[PDB]
Amino acid sequence: PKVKNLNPKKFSIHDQDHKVLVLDSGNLIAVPDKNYIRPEIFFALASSLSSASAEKGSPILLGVSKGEFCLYCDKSHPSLQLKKEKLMKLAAQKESARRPFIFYRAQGSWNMLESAAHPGWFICTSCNCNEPVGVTDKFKHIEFSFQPV
């Protein structure tokens, strides 16, 4: 019986200001990339949504700390958060439960990550260093370079 291998894509995330994503006291921040910096390694899994349009990107789940914590976007304004949950146990949840954790990926060498639970809200980094990673509906700082390891 044919089954999907479901191997997570392992990569670091760099923005256009050469800042890299790292985990600082349980929070995601963007820091100038340096030789002494250990970038956070993200684990990505394809996770389908039944309602999705043919023009949509590829729906994925995003994990951090060896896939022990998963990114979600939920609500005044929606915000990017981390939940202690194993990536593969999350992949096994029902559509409705996975939806807050799903992001749509749009790839030349750049990638955009749009929230599935809150369309129009994209994962972003600040112009400034050592600031948290968030979501934005205002469009420069949402194009990310995915570098594998």
Next chain:
Amino acid sequence: SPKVKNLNPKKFSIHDQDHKVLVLDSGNLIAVPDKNYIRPEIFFALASSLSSASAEKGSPILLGVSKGEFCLYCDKDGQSHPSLQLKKEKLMKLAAQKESARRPFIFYRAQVGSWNMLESAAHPGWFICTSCNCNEPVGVTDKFENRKHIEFSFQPV
């Protein structure tokens, strides 16, 4: 009388007592905040000897960076004060050099509990220090406002 000199380096990261760790940035030693995403610089250290040293000074040591490919030294480069510098020299070569050649590279290690003070042998009264600010170079000073900037812990790899 010449004391016993070591050839098998001690390997460790250096942290100040004000939440900073030492790293190499474009050939310069700097202290950055001590966080999980930081790859600390791994120092190579050797016990050395200095016959001219007086009774009160700590243990004479040599300190290297980048697997002992660069060695720390202290000198007055028509400069007013001594400064902390790096020379491209193998730590193993430096250890087997004559005393007069090693002297600028010797630092006296004084241990207080789990912390360490490091004094220039070439410039006594000048101690290795970090700034109160992050991402600044590591230097030498004969004056301090905060002891946490001249006290260092040596963490094993």
